[PDB]
């Protein structure tokens, strides 16, 4: 019964910020590398960060460093996606995963369970 549930997509202004979460259930979160995806229509799913389980270690797609931030809370089993400095660029469907190890990988086919998603539209 592995759920990974992502909320807080929405339209967000070039100067503003918005924040993703994505509550994990039904595995032992403190165990697994999460990351998040994003996809726009007709285009391949295209990393964007991920982090090891403690959430000492982390990655960014080149285009989004210093702009978002990810982090976990592993007491309320929790992944976030913060975007600071959102641009038109971002507008896109993000989705949470787990990798299937405790660190992670920019390669979409190895994280084993995915989220159902939440659209980004920076205007």
């Known amino acids: 019964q592995v759920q990974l549930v992502e909320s807080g997509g929405g339209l967000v202004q070039p100067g503003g910020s918005l924040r993703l979460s994505c509550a994990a259930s039904?595995?032992?979160?403190?165990?697994?590398?999460m990351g998040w995806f994003r996809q726009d229509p007709g285009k391949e799913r295209e990393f964007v960060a991920a982090?090891?389980?403690?959430?000492?270690?982390?990655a960014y797609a080149d285009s989004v460093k210093g702009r978002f931030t990810i982090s976990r809370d592993n007491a309320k089993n929790t992944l976030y996606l913060q975007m600071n400095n959102p641009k038109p660029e971002d507008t896109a469907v993000y989705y949470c995963?787990?990798?299937?190890?405790?660190?992670?990988?920019?390669?979409?086919?190895?994280?084993?369970?995915w989220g159902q998603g939440t659209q980004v539209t920076v205007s």
């Open positions: 995963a787990r990798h299937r190890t405790a660190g992670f990988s920019r390669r979409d086919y190895e994280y084993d369970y």
């Open positions: 039904g595995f032992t979160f403190d165990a697994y590398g």
């Open positions: 982090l090891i389980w403690s959430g000492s270690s982390t």
